[PDB]
Design a protein around this motif. Structure first.
Motif, PDB file in Angstrom:
ATOM      1  N   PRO A 149       0.814  -1.215   0.000  1.00  0.00           N
ATOM      2  CA  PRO A 149       0.000   0.000   0.000  1.00  0.00           C
ATOM      3  C   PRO A 149       0.845   1.261   0.000  1.00  0.00           C
ATOM      4  O   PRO A 149       2.027   1.202   0.306  1.00  0.00           O
ATOM      5  N   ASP A 150       0.234   2.386  -0.360  1.00  0.00           N
ATOM      6  CA  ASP A 150       0.876   3.687  -0.215  1.00  0.00           C
ATOM      7  C   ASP A 150       0.733   4.141   1.235  1.00  0.00           C
ATOM      8  O   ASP A 150      -0.339   4.013   1.830  1.00  0.00           O
ATOM      9  N   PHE A 151       1.816   4.675   1.792  1.00  0.00           N
ATOM     10  CA  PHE A 151       1.829   5.120   3.176  1.00  0.00           C
ATOM     11  C   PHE A 151       0.772   6.182   3.459  1.00  0.00           C
ATOM     12  O   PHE A 151       0.167   6.180   4.524  1.00  0.00           O
ATOM     13  N   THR A 152       0.546   7.077   2.500  1.00  0.00           N
ATOM     14  CA  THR A 152      -0.310   8.237   2.718  1.00  0.00           C
ATOM     15  C   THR A 152      -1.768   8.014   2.329  1.00  0.00           C
ATOM     16  O   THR A 152      -2.666   8.497   3.019  1.00  0.00           O
ATOM     17  N   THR A 153      -2.005   7.293   1.234  1.00  0.00           N
ATOM     18  CA  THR A 153      -3.359   7.153   0.683  1.00  0.00           C
ATOM     19  C   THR A 153      -3.918   5.719   0.692  1.00  0.00           C
ATOM     20  O   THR A 153      -5.002   5.471   0.159  1.00  0.00           O
ATOM     21  N   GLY A 154      -3.195   4.784   1.298  1.00  0.00           N
ATOM     22  CA  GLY A 154      -3.653   3.400   1.379  1.00  0.00           C
ATOM     23  C   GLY A 154      -3.410   2.640   0.091  1.00  0.00           C
ATOM     24  O   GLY A 154      -2.492   2.961  -0.660  1.00  0.00           O
ATOM     25  N   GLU A 155      -4.235   1.629  -0.167  1.00  0.00           N
ATOM     26  CA  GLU A 155      -4.082   0.801  -1.366  1.00  0.00           C
ATOM     27  C   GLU A 155      -4.299   1.616  -2.630  1.00  0.00           C
ATOM     28  O   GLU A 155      -5.275   2.367  -2.736  1.00  0.00           O
ATOM     29  N   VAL A 156      -3.379   1.459  -3.580  1.00  0.00           N
ATOM     30  CA  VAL A 156      -3.450   2.158  -4.851  1.00  0.00           C
ATOM     31  C   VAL A 156      -4.198   1.287  -5.850  1.00  0.00           C
ATOM     32  O   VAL A 156      -3.656   0.309  -6.360  1.00  0.00           O
ATOM     33  N   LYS A 157      -5.455   1.645  -6.099  1.00  0.00           N
ATOM     34  CA  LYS A 157      -6.280   0.983  -7.097  1.00  0.00           C
ATOM     35  C   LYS A 157      -6.597   1.958  -8.225  1.00  0.00           C
ATOM     36  O   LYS A 157      -6.384   3.162  -8.092  1.00  0.00           O
ATOM     37  N   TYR A 158      -7.105   1.423  -9.331  1.00  0.00           N
ATOM     38  CA  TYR A 158      -7.175   2.149 -10.592  1.00  0.00           C
ATOM     39  C   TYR A 158      -8.568   2.101 -11.190  1.00  0.00           C
ATOM     40  O   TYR A 158      -9.269   1.104 -11.053  1.00  0.00           O
ATOM     41  N   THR A 159      -8.968   3.192 -11.840  1.00  0.00           N
ATOM     42  CA  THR A 159     -10.150   3.191 -12.691  1.00  0.00           C
ATOM     43  C   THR A 159      -9.719   2.696 -14.059  1.00  0.00           C
ATOM     44  O   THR A 159      -8.742   3.183 -14.618  1.00  0.00           O
ATOM     45  N   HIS A 160     -10.440   1.710 -14.581  1.00  0.00           N
ATOM     46  CA  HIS A 160     -10.153   1.149 -15.890  1.00  0.00           C
ATOM     47  C   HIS A 160     -11.023   1.849 -16.919  1.00  0.00           C
ATOM     48  O   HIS A 160     -12.246   1.787 -16.840  1.00  0.00           O
ATOM     49  N   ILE A 161     -10.379   2.523 -17.869  1.00  0.00           N
ATOM     50  CA  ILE A 161     -11.072   3.241 -18.932  1.00  0.00           C
ATOM     51  C   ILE A 161     -10.564   2.812 -20.299  1.00  0.00           C
ATOM     52  O   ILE A 161      -9.533   2.157 -20.410  1.00  0.00           O
ATOM     53  N   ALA A 162     -11.294   3.202 -21.338  1.00  0.00           N
ATOM     54  CA  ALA A 162     -10.864   2.991 -22.717  1.00  0.00           C
ATOM     55  C   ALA A 162      -9.764   3.988 -23.062  1.00  0.00           C
ATOM     56  O   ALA A 162      -9.839   5.160 -22.695  1.00  0.00           O
ATOM     57  N   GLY A 163      -8.743   3.520 -23.768  1.00  0.00           N
ATOM     58  CA  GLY A 163      -7.609   4.367 -24.148  1.00  0.00           C
ATOM     59  C   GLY A 163      -7.909   5.262 -25.337  1.00  0.00           C
ATOM     60  O   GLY A 163      -7.257   5.178 -26.383  1.00  0.00           O
ATOM     61  N   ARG A 164      -8.930   6.093 -25.179  1.00  0.00           N
ATOM     62  CA  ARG A 164      -9.230   7.166 -26.110  1.00  0.00           C
ATOM     63  C   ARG A 164      -9.046   8.437 -25.296  1.00  0.00           C
ATOM     64  O   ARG A 164      -9.163   8.404 -24.063  1.00  0.00           O
ATOM     65  N   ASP A 165      -8.732   9.548 -25.955  1.00  0.00           N
ATOM     66  CA  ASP A 165      -8.524  10.798 -25.241  1.00  0.00           C
ATOM     67  C   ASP A 165      -7.380  10.672 -24.211  1.00  0.00           C
ATOM     68  O   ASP A 165      -7.507  11.111 -23.070  1.00  0.00           O
ATOM     69  N   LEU A 264      -4.655  -1.606 -34.079  1.00  0.00           N
ATOM     70  CA  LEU A 264      -5.456  -1.776 -32.859  1.00  0.00           C
ATOM     71  C   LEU A 264      -6.512  -0.684 -32.746  1.00  0.00           C
ATOM     72  O   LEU A 264      -6.194   0.501 -32.852  1.00  0.00           O
ATOM     73  N   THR A 265      -7.762  -1.086 -32.519  1.00  0.00           N
ATOM     74  CA  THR A 265      -8.875  -0.141 -32.465  1.00  0.00           C
ATOM     75  C   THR A 265      -8.940   0.551 -31.104  1.00  0.00           C
ATOM     76  O   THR A 265      -9.166   1.758 -31.029  1.00  0.00           O
ATOM     77  N   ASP A 266      -8.742  -0.216 -30.033  1.00  0.00           N
ATOM     78  CA  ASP A 266      -8.754   0.331 -28.680  1.00  0.00           C
ATOM     79  C   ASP A 266      -7.819  -0.420 -27.741  1.00  0.00           C
ATOM     80  O   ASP A 266      -7.456  -1.571 -27.988  1.00  0.00           O
ATOM     81  N   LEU A 267      -7.445   0.249 -26.654  1.00  0.00           N
ATOM     82  CA  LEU A 267      -6.600  -0.337 -25.626  1.00  0.00           C
ATOM     83  C   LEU A 267      -7.113   0.045 -24.242  1.00  0.00           C
ATOM     84  O   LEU A 267      -7.708   1.107 -24.058  1.00  0.00           O
ATOM     85  N   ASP A 268      -6.885  -0.836 -23.269  1.00  0.00           N
ATOM     86  CA  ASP A 268      -7.213  -0.545 -21.884  1.00  0.00           C
ATOM     87  C   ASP A 268      -6.271   0.541 -21.377  1.00  0.00           C
ATOM     88  O   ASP A 268      -5.123   0.631 -21.820  1.00  0.00           O
ATOM     89  N   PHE A 269      -6.778   1.370 -20.467  1.00  0.00           N
ATOM     90  CA  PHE A 269      -5.989   2.407 -19.801  1.00  0.00           C
ATOM     91  C   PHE A 269      -6.404   2.483 -18.334  1.00  0.00           C
ATOM     92  O   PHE A 269      -7.551   2.209 -17.994  1.00  0.00           O
ATOM     93  N   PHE A 270      -5.463   2.846 -17.469  1.00  0.00           N
ATOM     94  CA  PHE A 270      -5.673   2.773 -16.020  1.00  0.00           C
ATOM     95  C   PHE A 270      -5.169   4.025 -15.296  1.00  0.00           C
ATOM     96  O   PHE A 270      -4.051   4.476 -15.536  1.00  0.00           O
ATOM     97  N   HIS A 286     -10.749  -4.548 -23.020  1.00  0.00           N
ATOM     98  CA  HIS A 286     -11.876  -5.205 -22.351  1.00  0.00           C
ATOM     99  C   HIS A 286     -13.098  -4.292 -22.296  1.00  0.00           C
ATOM    100  O   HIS A 286     -13.377  -3.690 -21.255  1.00  0.00           O
ATOM    101  N   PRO A 287     -13.841  -4.191 -23.411  1.00  0.00           N
ATOM    102  CA  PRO A 287     -15.025  -3.333 -23.457  1.00  0.00           C
ATOM    103  C   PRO A 287     -16.220  -3.842 -22.649  1.00  0.00           C
ATOM    104  O   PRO A 287     -17.216  -3.128 -22.534  1.00  0.00           O
ATOM    105  N   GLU A 288     -16.126  -5.056 -22.106  1.00  0.00           N
ATOM    106  CA  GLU A 288     -17.231  -5.678 -21.366  1.00  0.00           C
ATOM    107  C   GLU A 288     -17.529  -4.913 -20.088  1.00  0.00           C
ATOM    108  O   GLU A 288     -18.688  -4.674 -19.749  1.00  0.00           O
TER     109      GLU A 288
END
Length: 422
Positions: A149-165, A264-270, A286-288
Motif C-alpha cells: 500500500p501507499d503510506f499516505t493514501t492506502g491501497e493504490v487501485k485504478y479506474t479502468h477506462i478505454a484508451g481514447r482521449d 489496434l482499435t482500442d486499448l485498456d488504460f488505467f 476489455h469493453p465488457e
C-alpha cells in the motif's frame, strides 16, 4: 434502455471524481438537477439529444462548458463522434502491480519494471507506465496477489477506462495533436510486447528486452524521452539497455511515426487513486466492463479556459438621451472560427445565440457580462442604432460603431461611449 454515468472530474487531478458540483441534465424525459458524487450519477436514457449543464461549481473551480450528447441505438455520441469516455462502474477498483519478484536483466541489472493490470476474471495483462517521473504501480512480492500500500493514501487501485482521449494524461508529450498522439501510442503497443510467451519477431532479444524497448517507445511520446545511448545513462535505469534493444526501441518509434494507420482499435488504460502515481497504458482491450460516461471536467478558476465579455454604455454631451436603449449585435466564433449556436449565460438574463449572433440593449450606465466564453474565441460587436452620436469604444473613435477581436485569451470589456453635443 441505455445506462450512462455522469462523472465530474478536475482537470489535472483524476485521482478522484470532483464532488460538490451542482449539475443539470436537460433533454430535447424529465429534466433534473443533482450533486456530483464519488462514483457517478447513474441514469437510464431513451434515444435523444441531452445537455449537461453546471449551475455552480466547487470553490476554486470555474463553471464548465455544457456538454451536449446524443443517445441512439444503445450507443452514446458527443457533439458527432462516438463517446470517447468509457469507464468501469466502480472507479478505483482495479488492481495493478509491479512484479517485484520477477527478475530478468536488461544488460547487467534487473529490468525491475514489470508492470501488470489485473482483469476482472483474475488474469493479468502487461501494462506500461505513462508518466516516466511519477511513481510505479504498487510493489508485489507474490505476482499480484498482494500489493504494497501507499503510506499516505492506502491501497493504490485504478479506474479502468478505454484508451481514447489519452493526450491529457501526459506530462511532457512530443506531439501537439491528441489524435496523432493516440495514433502513436496505439502503434507502439501494436508492434511492441503485449503477451507473455509471444513470438519475439526481433532476433537476439528476450521478452523483457522487447518489453523494455516498448516502454521507452511510450516515454518517447509521453515524456519526450530521447533514443540516445549517451542521454539515457541515468534516465530511470535505461542506461542498462544494450545497443540491440535501443535499436528495436527506435524501430517501434519509427513505425509509430510512419503514415500507416494503427491496427489496434482500442486499448485498456488505467488511472490510479493517487496523483503521485503514474497512469498505465494497457496492451489488451476489455469493453465488457466499461459503460458510457458523460464526463465533465472542471478547471481551476485561477487559470481559466473560459472568459467573460462585458459591454457598458455611457452617454455624454448635454444633448445625449440617457433613457435610450442602444442596441448591440454580437457575433461570436470559437477556437476554430465556427459560429456559436449556444446559450451564453450572463450576470442578468441568459442569452440565446443563433447562427453566431445575438442582440442586446443597454442604456446609459447599464452593463452586461457574457460569461463562460471558450479559450481563443473572437467577437464582432456592432452598435446598430448609433445614428446621431459620435461613438467611442474603449476611448477610441469608431466611425462605424463596430469593433472586433480574435484569439481572446482573457476577460475583455467593450465600454461604448455615445457622445452627442448640441
Amino acid at each position: 434502455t441505455t445506462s450512462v454515468l455522469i462523472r465530474k472530474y478536475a482537470i489535472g487531478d483524476y485521482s478522484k471524481l470532483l464532488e460538490g458540483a451542482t449539475l443539470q441534465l436537460t433533454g430535447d424525459f424529465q429534466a433534473r438537477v443533482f450533486s456530483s458524487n464519488d462514483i457517478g450519477e447513474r441514469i437510464e436514457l431513451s434515444d435523444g439529444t441531452y445537455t449537461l449543464t453546471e449551475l455552480n461549481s466547487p470553490a476554486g473551480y470555474s463553471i464548465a462548458e455544457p456538454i451536449t450528447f446524443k443517445v441512439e441505438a444503445g450507443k452514446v455520441y458527443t457533439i458527432q463522434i462516438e463517446n470517447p469516455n468509457k469507464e468501469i462502474v466502480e472507479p478505483y477498483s482495479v488492481e495493478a502491480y509491479n512484479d517485484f519478484e520477477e527478475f530478468s536483466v536488461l544488460t547487467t541489472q534487473n529490468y525491475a519494471k514489470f508492470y501488470y493490470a489485473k482483469n476482472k476474471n483474475g488474469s493479468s495483462q502487461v501494462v506500461y507506465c505513462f508518466n516516466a517521473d511519477l511513481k510505479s504501480p504498487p510493489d508485489s512480492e507474490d505476482g499480484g496477489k498482494t500489493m504494497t500500500p501507499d503510506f499516505t493514501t492506502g491501497e493504490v487501485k485504478y479506474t479502468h477506462i478505454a484508451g481514447r482521449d489519452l493526450f491529457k494524461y501526459t506530462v511532457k508529450p512530443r506531439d501537439t495533436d491528441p489524435d496523432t498522439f493516440l495514433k502513436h501510442i496505439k502503434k507502439v503497443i501494436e508492434k511492441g510486447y503485449r503477451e507473455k510467451g509471444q513470438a519475439i519477431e526481433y532476433s537476439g532479444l528476450t521478452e523483457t528486452q522487447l518489453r523494455a524497448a516498448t516502454q521507452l517507445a511510450i516515454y518517447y511520446f509521453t515524456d519526450s524521452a530521447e533514443l540516445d545511448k549517451d542521454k539515457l545513462k541515468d534516465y530511470h535505469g535505461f542506461g542498462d539497455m544494450n545497443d540491440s534493444t535501443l535499436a528495436v526501441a527506435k524501430i517501434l518509434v519509427e513505425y509509430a511515426q510512419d503514415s500507416n494507420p494503427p491496427q489496434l482499435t482500442d486499448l485498456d488504460f488505467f488511472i490510479p487513486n493517487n496523483n503521485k502515481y503514474q497512469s498505465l497504458i494497457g496492451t489488451q482491450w476489455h469493453p465488457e466492463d466499461l459503460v458510457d460516461i458523460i464526463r465533465m471536467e472542471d478547471k481551476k478558476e485561477v487559470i481559466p479556459v473560459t472568459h467573460n465579455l462585458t459591454l457598458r454604455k455611457t452617454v455624454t454631451g448635454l444633448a445625449g438621451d440617457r433613457t435610450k436603449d442602444f442596441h448591440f449585435e454580437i457575433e461570436l466564433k470559437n477556437n476554430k472560427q465556427e459560429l456559436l449556436s449556444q446559450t451564453v449565460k450572463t450576470d442578468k438574463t441568459n442569452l440565446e445565440f443563433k447562427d453566431g449572433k445575438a442582440t442586446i440593449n443597454l442604456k446609459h450606465g447599464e452593463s452586461l457580462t457574457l460569461q463562460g466564453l471558450p479559450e481563443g474565441y473572437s467577437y464582432l460587436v456592432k452598435e446598430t442604432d448609433s445614428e446621431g452620436y459620435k461613438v467611442k469604444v474603449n476611448s477610441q473613435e469608431v466611425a462605424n460603431a463596430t469593433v472586433s477581436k480574435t484569439g481572446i485569451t482573457s476577460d475583455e470589456t467593450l465600454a461604448f461611449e455615445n457622445n452627442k453635443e448640441p
